């Protein structure tokens, strides 16, 4: 049982490691350029929002698994 919790817990950390990598492309522009053109800004946030909403959907389905496995080990013990 305890390895199944361990396999999901370090899969949610990976995805929270994936969520941070989605705003990464913008931060690497503010690092390098001092004036961001509006069309180039206007599109990047839309990709950064297309991922983050998609990645936040995934975390819902993973954080729900742990609660199910926590409930299972409460019926058992």
């Amino acid at each position: 049982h305890m390895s199944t919790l361990k396999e999901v817990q370090d899969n949610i950390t990976l995805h929270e490691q994936r969520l941070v990598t989605c705003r990464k492309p913008l931060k690497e522009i503010e690092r390098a350029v001092e004036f961001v053109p509006v069309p180039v800004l206007k599109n990047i946030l839309q990709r950064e929002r297309a991922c983050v909403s998609a990645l936040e959907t995934k975390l819902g389905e993973l954080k729900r698994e742990l609660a199910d496995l926590i409930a299972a080990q409460k019926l058992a013990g």
Binding site: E28, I29, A32, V33, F35, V36, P37, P39, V40, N43
Partner: protein
């Protein structure tokens, strides 16, 4: 500070050709690719998005995949050269270039596309070898509509029929076809002129009667 210069605000382009519209900007000894952003667009269609030394394909509009490309080697000379391949009528309009290097600025460029009757296909056949009557043909693709004037080597007008339809390979190009059926002999020269309006363009092919 930073200024973007356009060597020519207007580009007149022929149909089915290449095109290299240029935006300039100041550069000092070498380039700092990290701090450079180049962006081309027309009618709010993303064409080029050059960031961190590489074009961002995921944003480039679909109808430009494999026909739009920015020339990296020119950037070291302070020249953001957008290149389009096989220019069409749909490429006409107003183009914007936006460059960010230290400071920033944008400039507009206008593109107008000729659809001329440059390529003229000619065919000579022998209707009756007895009477030596031939069938001369000329056809070309252009826009707008054109008429064909059959003139001799003596600059005299002969009558023919002109069938004018729409192109299949392309969208609205008019396919103009004219035919001559005149009794003529070997080595006799003829001309088929393609006169169209807006603006006045005359294009003429030369058909010489062969032997036997």
């Amino acid at each position: 500070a930073f200024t973007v210069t356009v060597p020519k605000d207007l580009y007149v382009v022929e149909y089915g050709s290449n095109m290299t519209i240029e935006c300039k900007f100041p550069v000092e000894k070498q380039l700092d690719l990290a701090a450079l952003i180049v962006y081309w667009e027309m009618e709010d269609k993303n064409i080029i998005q050059f960031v961190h030394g590489e074009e961002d394909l995921k944003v480039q509009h679909s109808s430009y995949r494999q026909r739009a490309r920015l020339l990296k080697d020119q950037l070291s000379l302070g020249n953001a050269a957008l290149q389009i391949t096989d220019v069409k009528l749909q490429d006409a309009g107003v183009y914007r270039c936006m460059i960010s290097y230290g400071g920033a600025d944008y400039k507009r460029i206008t593109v107008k596309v000729n659809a001329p009757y440059n390529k003229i296909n000619q065919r000579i056949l022998v209707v009756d070898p007895v009477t030596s009557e031939h069938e001369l043909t000329c056809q070309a693709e252009g826009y707008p509509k054109a008429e064909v004037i059959w003139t001799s080597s003596d600059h005299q007008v002969l009558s023919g029929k002109t069938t004018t339809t729409n192109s299949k390979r392309e969208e609205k190009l008019f396919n103009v076809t004219s035919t001559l059926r005149i009794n003529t002999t070997t080595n006799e020269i003829f001309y088929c002129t393609f006169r169209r309006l807006d603006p006045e363009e005359n294009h003429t092919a030369e058909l010489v009667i062969p032997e036997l």
